[PDB]
Amino acid sequence: LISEISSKSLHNLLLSEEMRSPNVREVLYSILF
C-alpha cells in the first residue's frame, strides 16, 4: 500500500463532464458483455 496513497492522490477526475441510477449501470454492463 506504499504506492496506493499516491495513486489515490494522482487521479485527475476533477473534470467530471458527465451531465440516473446504478441499475442503469447494471443493464449497460450486461449490454456491453
Binding site: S3, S7, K8, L10, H11, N12, L13, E18, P22
Partner: peptide, 30 residues
C-alpha cells in the same frame, strides 16, 4: 477514496492504465 462503483468507463480505463504504468515503471529498471 471515492470507490470505483460510481466511476465511468474511461475513468476505469484511467485506473487500469495507471496500474499498468506503475507496473511498467517498476519493471523497466531491469
Amino acid at each position: 477514496w471515492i470507490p470505483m462503483s460510481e466511476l465511468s468507463l474511461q475513468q476505469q480505463f484511467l485506473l487500469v492504465t495507471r496500474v499498468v504504468s506503475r507496473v511498467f515503471n517498476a519493471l523497466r529498471k531491469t
